[PDB]
């Protein structure tokens, strides 16, 4: 019913945020709504993470429409200030994208969370 | 047959001849190489 | 329209980079008979041979031929019907198993062919990237399986 | 030996492209068509008998 | 509309082909989308790029909102 | 490559309703049901005929997997002019519009989708195309939309679901004619990421066979996609 | 057909 | 356009009568379509403008007719002898192609036969192919009455 | 044991009566399946016995919904009540199993069947479509599906005309056209009166 | 009660065919397509035997407005015939001149 849907429970967010920080260290993370759109258009995204407290929430509802059309899992997180923390950038981030790389060192963790997101969806 | 041509056309006809000689040349070289193999 | 089959993406040249444990294995009728002669269990003698789980598979053709063998081969039919032995449907008229096994392997490069028939083996050995399994001596042997 | 096998592998990768087509990152930039062309009368596909 | 203008907005929506199309595009695409009639128009280019992004978010708030308001368009 | 000022020579494809644009490069193009606009920002070929100005749309293989099939050389395509088509997994007008282009005015396309948000775009695009029927429903329950569907010669399943085999069988049994068509796209990662792609592909072929689908053909979609194939079969109601 | 042709009054 | 003016909304289809615009079989077809229609409802603000556009269409269709009757009136006074022979429309086109009555007057009959087919003419002349034989005069009534090769004569 | 068949058309509820019961053991045999495709054979199996067209567009969306989640509409009760004899228990063929319990509740005297034999007969009825109505006025099944499907689709999505922005792209596309035509026509006015 | 029942008792998919004596411009376009392999030294094609189709048409491509910078040709560069556009390209003209001279020398 709410526009921000599905939005992860507490335990899932830490698993999500843990992957984001690892992806940031490994240069596999794209941060910000505009980059996420580009990755979806390129078909290079494993999945999309988004903030449900964005003010207004509306400015990031274009991404799920793109995500579904490419069959890309997506999920919201309650806090944007917390999402920026995981990304490693000095500022809040409302949307982030994990770039696809089957040769990455964190492939198992990315697919682990990715499976949970689909079950949520 | 015989026709007298304008300036623009003769450039067109001159080039299409240039293409075909090159095309025959490139095609003509490929055949002996595979024939040699 | 001319048709020339594509080379399967599973094969790096003649190396099959796809077949991987657990393995999927096709059973020929003679394979069951010889196995009974050598007192080798189907599921295990394959597990011992490859040191991996094996998923034995029987088509409609091989099951039909086993039934046609008669009461003398009642044992082979019972072993063929063990629940672990999964079954493959066939959508081709002929009941000849040799061509059906060859047609299946040509298309999906995931199967090991378990047979001792000299004629059938030769056709399989020509097809690239196809491990070939047989029972010889005391136990099973695998020829074209690099991981061993 | 390590250098020799490196050159052998990368050479093998080139030959793999000839025997069969291989994914190469997908589309990059605007779609500019099939560079090598389309063959109408040829099928690469394997038939179920 | 409040951000740039009603007519200017009508061109940009027609430029994309639909408001849904305009919202989905990235910020860079929106800028070049109206770069042939100079809708949004070195320092001059910076404002045009800056306004293009704001138009992008403004186009969004109109699209996926059942009853869009002008409260955000004013502050943007 | 195909820069806006270039001209192109259009000639027909082996498959009816499909065309090729020759030039320095070759493009797969379908004639536009609704001329003067693009569904998704694709390049369009305008041709003058006695004079009426007909328009063609380019078909991008990397964005439409059905197009990737024609690129790879499917021997036969059940989708053809004057044929009713049931498009399952119709996210948007990506391929349905191109499928609608092939069938033409006389034919029809039944687009089925689950999520509402793409349905809004599917409905809007469907309004430009009178021959397209969008069914915003869950394909796992064909009896929900048994109402809106007649017989269909070909069922094209684009659904990316682990249980894609079950949905195909249920839809085919209700609506697909005898000797009717089925064209399926399989992505192995979604169904089973644990095993290699080809073991997955063999599995669905078996799942098609139990459901009275005689598979006719299978083709991998590389270099346009990884881990994908298109399997073509025919529906024997009586038996295999 | 251009081969069938021969130019005249060249200018 | 007239249908829009008589009925603005499909709901009006049941009670509105389209006899003067459409025949019986056609007017009933639009009515049946109205209830099973595909379209969405529109606001009165939207209806007001589309009616205004439709009002322009019928008025455009009107003024086109007076101009057509006018061109006949002008054409029967400046060059009456052609109006009977070739007609008002073809005759006006013939004069316009030359640009003046005197210009076409000094033009010979053979040219007058093939004025409107220069593209086919000069293409045929340069390529040694048969030439056109009708030009703009093909649309004259007398040519239409003729059949087969007699049309060319 | 099937005596009556309930088929649903966009125009109306259709009920058919089964004179001849196709062989159940030999259902999978080729010839009986060929009979389904052949119209002449099929007509010997069933005929249309009733057809109740829907009053209008609105009622169709209601029954199109009511059929969707497996409920019996007021119209379906009327058509079944008029036709099915009170009766041991009359047998009705229905494609969907979910509607079966709903029919049973309304009519305790009818037992529903949705087995493959019923499905095969249902598959026949949809196949020939309007041909089985013997010329009864059923409109056309294709166009009726078109209007219903969008109605059935836009109902769930809650599509609204307020979201519609197409009027904008037409208002602009027309506005610049007048700016061109107002100039072009006005120039012609200048020339016409310019002579005078 | 009154009843009238008793009273009632008593083609879209066909391409245009070429005109005979077809234009001089169109054939050269066809010849370029047939011999497109030799046009660019750095580009190569699948081996194909291309024959002039029985039915065909010549069309103009329309770029999407978002592709204004990427895939749009300037109006002056646009030409009616493929040959004429290739004439404008200076790099091509240089390559053909060099190759043609070499072939003539060996001949
Ligand atoms: Zn078999």
């Amino acid at each position: 019913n709410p526009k921000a849907f599905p939005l992860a429970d507490a335990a899932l967010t830490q698993q999500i945020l843990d992957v984001v920080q690892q992806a940031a260290n490994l240069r596999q993370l794209k941060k910000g709504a505009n980059e996420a759109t580009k990755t979806l258009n390129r078909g290079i995204s494993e999945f999309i993470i988004m903030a449900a407290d964005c003010e207004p929430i509306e400015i990031l509802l274009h991404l799920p429409l793109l995500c579904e059309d490419k069959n890309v899992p997506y999920v919201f997180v309650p806090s944007r200030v917390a999402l920026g923390r995981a990304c490693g950038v000095s500022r809040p981030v409302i949307a982030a994208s994990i770039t696809t790389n089957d040769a990455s060192a964190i492939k198992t963790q990315i697919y682990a969370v990715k499976d949970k997101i689909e079950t949520l969806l | 047959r015989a026709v007298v041509l304008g300036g623009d056309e003769k450039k067109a006809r001159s080039f299409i001849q240039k293409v075909l000689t090159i095309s025959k040349a490139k095609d003509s070289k490929r055949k002996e190489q595979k024939a040699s193999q | 329209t001319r048709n020339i089959p594509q080379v399967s993406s599973a094969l790096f040249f003649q190396y099959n980079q796809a077949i991987k444990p657990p393995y999927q294995v096709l059973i020929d009728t003679n394979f069951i008979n010889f196995s009974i002669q050598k007192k080798v269990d189907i599921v295990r003698g394959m597990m011992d041979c490859l040191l991996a789980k094996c998923n034995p598979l029987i088509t409609d053709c091989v099951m039909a031929e086993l039934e046609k063998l008669g009461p003398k081969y009642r044992i082979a039919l019972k072993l063929a019907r063990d629940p672990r032995i999964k079954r493959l449907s066939c959508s081709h008229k002929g009941t000849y198993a040799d061509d059906c096994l060859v047609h299946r392997v040509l298309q999906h490069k995931c199967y090991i062919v378990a047979t001792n028939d000299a004629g059938l083996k030769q056709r399989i050995r020509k097809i690239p990237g196809i491990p070939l399994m047989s029972v010889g001596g005391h136990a099973y042997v695998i020829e074209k399986l690099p991981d061993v | 030996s390590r250098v020799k096998k490196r050159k052998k592998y990368q050479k093998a990768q080139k030959k793999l492209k000839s025997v069969r087509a291989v994914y190469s990152g997908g589309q990059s930039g605007v779609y500019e068509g099939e560079k090598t062309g389309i063959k109408k009368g040829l099928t690469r596909s394997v038939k179920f008998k | 509309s409040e951000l740039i203008g009603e007519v200017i907005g009508a061109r940009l929506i027609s430029h994309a082909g639909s408001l849904t199309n305009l919202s989905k595009q990235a910020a860079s695409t929106v800028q070049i989308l109206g770069a042939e009639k100079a809708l949004f128009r070195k320092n001059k280019g910076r404002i045009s790029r800056y306004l293009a992004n704001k138009c992008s978010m403004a186009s969004r708030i109109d699209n996926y909102s059942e009853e869009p308001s002008n409260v955000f368009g004013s502050v943007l | 490559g195909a820069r806006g000022g270039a001209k192109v020579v259009i000639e027909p494809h082996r498959h009816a309703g499909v065309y090729i644009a020759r030039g320095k490069e070759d493009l797969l193009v379908t004639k536009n049901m609704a001329p003067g606009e693009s569904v998704y920002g694709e390049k369009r070929i305008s041709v003058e005929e006695p004079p009426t100005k007909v328009e063609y749309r380019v078909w991008n293989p990397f964005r439409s997997k059905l197009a990737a099939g024609i690129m790879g050389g499917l021997d036969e395509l059940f989708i053809a002019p004057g044929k009713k088509v049931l498009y399952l997994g119709a996210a948007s007008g990506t391929s349905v519009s191109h499928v609608s282009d092939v069938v033409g005015p006389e034919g029809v396309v039944y687009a089925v989708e689950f999520s509402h948000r793409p349905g809004r775009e599917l409905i809007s695009m469907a309004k430009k195309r009178p021959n397209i029927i969008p069914i915003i429903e869950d394909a796992r329950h064909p009896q929900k939309y048994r109402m809106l569907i007649g017989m269909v010669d070909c069922v094209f399943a684009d659904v990316a679901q682990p249980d894609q085999a079950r949905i195909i069988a249920l839809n085919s049994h209700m609506f697909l004619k005898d000797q009717g068509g089925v064209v399926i796209s399989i992505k192995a990662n979604c169904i089973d990421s644990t095993v290699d792609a080809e073991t997955v592909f063999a599995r669905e072929v078996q799942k098609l066979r139990e459901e009275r689908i005689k598979p006719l053909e299978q083709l991998t979609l590389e270099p346009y996609e990884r881990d994908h194939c298109i399997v073509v079969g025919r529906y024997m109601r009586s038996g295999l | 057909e251009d081969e069938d042709e021969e130019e005249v009054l060249a200018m | 356009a007239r249908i829009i003016l008589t009925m603005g909304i499909r709901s009006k289809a049941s009670e509105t009568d389209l006899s003067e615009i459409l025949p019986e079989e056609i007017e009933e077809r639009v009515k049946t379509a109205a209830e099973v229609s595909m379209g969405t409802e529109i606001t009165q603000t939207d209806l007001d403008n589309i009616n205004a556009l439709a009002e322009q269409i019928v008025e455009f269709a009107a003024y086109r007719e007076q101009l057509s009757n006018y061109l006949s009136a002008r054409m029967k006074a400046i060059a009456p002898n052609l109006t009977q022979l070739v007609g008002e429309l073809v005759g006006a086109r013939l004069i316009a192609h030359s640009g003046s009555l005197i210009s076409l007057a000094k033009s010979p009959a053979s040219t007058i036969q093939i004025l409107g087919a220069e593209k086919a003419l000069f293409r045929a002349l340069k390529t040694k192919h048969d030439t056109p034989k009708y030009g703009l005069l093909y649309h004259a009534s007398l040519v239409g009455q003729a059949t087969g090769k007699n049309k060319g004569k | 044991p099937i005596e009556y068949l309930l088929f649903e058309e966009p125009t109306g509820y259709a009920v058919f009566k089964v004179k001849l019961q196709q062989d159940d053991i030999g259902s999978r045999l080729k010839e009986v399946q060929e009979q389904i495709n052949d119209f002449g054979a099929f007509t010997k199996l069933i005929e249309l016995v009733s057809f109740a067209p829907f009053k209008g567009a609105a009622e169709a969306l209601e029954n199109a919904n009511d059929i969707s989640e497996g409920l019996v509409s007021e119209s379906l009760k009327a058509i079944l009540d008029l036709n099915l004899p009170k009766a041991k228990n009359i047998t009705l063929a229905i494609s969907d199993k979910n509607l079966g319990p709903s029919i049973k509740e309304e009519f305790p005297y009818v037992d529903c069947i949705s087995n493959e034999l019923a499905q095969d007969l249902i598959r026949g009825v949809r196949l020939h479509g309007e041909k089985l109505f013997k010329g009864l006025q059923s409109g056309d099944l294709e166009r009726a599906q078109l209007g219903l499907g969008h109605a059935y689709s836009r109902a769930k999505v809650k599509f609204s005309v307020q979201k519609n922005d197409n009027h904008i792209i037409q208002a602009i596309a027309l506005l610049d056209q007048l700016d061109k035509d107002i100039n072009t026509f006005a120039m012609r006015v200048k020339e016409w009166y310019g002579w005078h | 009660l009154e009843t009238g029942f008793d009273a009632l008792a008593n083609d879209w998919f066909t391409l245009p065919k070429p005109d005979d004596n077809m234009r001089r411009e169109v054939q050269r376009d066809l010849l370029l397509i047939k011999h497109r392999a030799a046009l660019d030294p750095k580009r190569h094609y699948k081996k194909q035997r291309w024959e002039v189709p029985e039915r065909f048409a010549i069309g103009t491509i329309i770029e999407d407005k978002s592709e204004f910078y990427s895939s749009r040709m300037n109006r002056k560069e646009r030409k009616s015939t493929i040959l004429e556009t290739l004439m404008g390209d200076e790099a091509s003209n240089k390559y053909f001149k060099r190759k043609y001279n070499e072939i003539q020398e060996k001949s």
Side-chain angles (χ1 to χ4, degrees), chain I residues 116-142:
Chain I
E116 192 276 331
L117 275 295
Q119 299 305 123
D120 193 0
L121 274 190
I122 300 294
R123 191 159 146 128
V125 176
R126 204 182 307 286
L127 184 47
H128 304 116
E130 65 275 19
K131 191 186 287 184
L132 295 158
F133 287 80
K134 309 162 298 181
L136 287 174
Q137 296 198 350
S138 179
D140 56 354
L141 314 183
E142 195 274 333

Side-chain angles (χ1 to χ4, degrees), chain C residues 59-61 90 92 94 100:
Chain C
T59 74
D60 291 331
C61 302
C90 297
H92 62 90
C100 183

Side-chain angles (χ1 to χ4, degrees), chain A residues 9-25:
Chain A
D9 80 22
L12 178 45
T13 61
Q14 308 321 317
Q15 306 154 47
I16 297 169
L17 291 194
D18 189 358
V19 173
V20 176
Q21 195 181 62
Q22 283 143 0
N25 203 356

Side-chain angles (χ1 to χ4, degrees), chain C residues 1 3 6-10 17-20 22 24 87-92 104 107-111, chain F residues 14 75 195-203 205-207 209-210 213-215 217-220 222 240:
Chain C
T1 177
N3 186 4
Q6 85 198 340
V7 180
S8 175
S9 61
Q17 54 157 349
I19 187 165
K20 181 68 173 66
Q24 292 194 306
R87 189 162 326 97
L88 277 296
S89 295
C90 297
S91 68
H92 62 90
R104 275 221 187 289
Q107 293 174 230
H108 293 94
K109 303 288 205 250
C110 278
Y111 303 169
Chain F
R14 185 170 41 58
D75 53 278
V195 70
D196 59 358
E198 297 91 39
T199 300
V200 176
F201 290 145
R203 199 178 301 174
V205 171
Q206 188 274 331
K207 298 294 187 291
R209 290 178 188 271
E210 65 183 1
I213 298 294
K214 179 174 182 178
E217 188 78 27
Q218 59 79 50
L219 183 63
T220 61
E222 56 80 11
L240 269 183

